[PDB]
Every structure is written in C-alpha cells, then in structure tokens.
Design a protein around this ligand. Sequence first.
Ligand SMILES: [Zn+2]
Ligand SMILES: [Zn+2]
Lengths: 120, 126
Amino acid sequence: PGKATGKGKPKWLDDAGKDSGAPIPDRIADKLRDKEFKSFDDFRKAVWEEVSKDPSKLNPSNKSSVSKGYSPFTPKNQQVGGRKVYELHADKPISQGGEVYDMDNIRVTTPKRHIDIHRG
Amino acid sequence: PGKATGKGKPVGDKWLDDAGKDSGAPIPDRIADKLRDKEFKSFDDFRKAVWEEVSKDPELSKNLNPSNKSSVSKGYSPFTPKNQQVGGRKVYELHADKPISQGGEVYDMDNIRVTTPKRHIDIHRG
Ligand SMILES: [Zn+2]
Ligand SMILES: [Zn+2]
C-alpha cells in the first residue's frame, strides 16, 4: 500500500508517443496528492476519472472510456499486441517499493513508446 | 529492424509459473535456437514468432489450457491467471531485463524474459 506525492506539470497526449511520455498534469496531481491506494490499478483508476471531469477532454468512445476509469485508446500505429491504451510509466524505478506514487516521476506513454523506452 | 541472438535457458513444463516472480521466465532454449539470426521488422513480429514457436513445441505448450493454445497457435500471447492481469494488460509481456537493444537493433533472448503484467509493472516501479 502507498500514497501519491508531487506536483506534475501544467493534446498533451500527442506528446505521449515520444521522449519520456507526457507528465501528470497539475490539476490531477492536486486532486490525488496524499490519497493512499491499495494497488496500482486503483491509482490508475483515479488518474483517468480526472482527465474526464477536467474539461484536456477525446472522441466519444474515448470520453466514455475515461469516465469509467479506463485509459483511452491510442492511435492504431501506437498499439502493440493486446496493449491498446495509454500506460503509466515510472521515469525512474523509485516507487520506494510500491509505497510511493511520485507524480513528478510518473509519465503517460503509448504502448509503442513505453516498450521502446525499456528497450524493444 | 532487428535480429534475434541469445540461447535462452532449459526450462521444464510449468515454465510460465515463474513469470510472475523475480525477473520473469527465460525464453526457452529450444525457442531461441529456432529464432536465432532471424530478422524482425517490428517488436510485434518478434513477439508473434516467440508464441508461434511455443505452440509448435509439445513439452512447452502442454500445460497450456485450451484458450491459451488457441491464442499461441495464432502468435498471440496467452492470458495469465486473473490475479496477474492489470487494467487492459491481460496476457504475458516480453520484458527487457536491461535496456540493451541497441535502439531496437537486437532481440537478445538471454536478456528478454516472459512476465505477467503485475510483475512487469512491479519490476519497473509500480
Ligand atoms: Zn515504464
Ligand atoms: Zn520490461
């Protein structure tokens, strides 16, 4: 069990397909900061509810997805195998053993990008 | 475009049971030897080769349930136990132990491991 820290930074999702991904925006950072979380999808289910309700809004199927706490589908050429959505990526392995959800470290990436980061 | 190199490890039946612990399960040595010095255009095509070769191997496929057999026959990764799945990530994932692909130019089958989405996120830091 762990909790969320950090400030994130001010589509941003068009950036998700290169470099280290996109940052967790400040407003979302502000809303999750200090919340304890049982597991990794619990934290991820919190992040995406936040994109929806923050008018950063996403085609109809994508707006519906995030509203229920699902990552939105990436473009076809950015998906890989069964991975069709945006993924949360730790820029460094510093989760302090899954005790921290450092929202300055955590980034948003396409599957293609995220695999290319860790290697491919 | 990148080429496969490597060797992998001898594994038994139940090799996938180890995919949710430590650094994941090794590519089996028989698989690596079928794939060595092959060229793959994309990471997907390498992933597809790995799983098509799994389906063509009695001892490596035999613990696989009927659903996962159908998956691997087509080059798709097999589904993990439910408690190893995370969000839309439901099938085993190929993982680089170290970031040593040389910009995608190699698939090092000593470095590449088979993990569950749960373990995989944990390795990189959840
Ligand atoms: Zn990552
Ligand atoms: Zn990995």
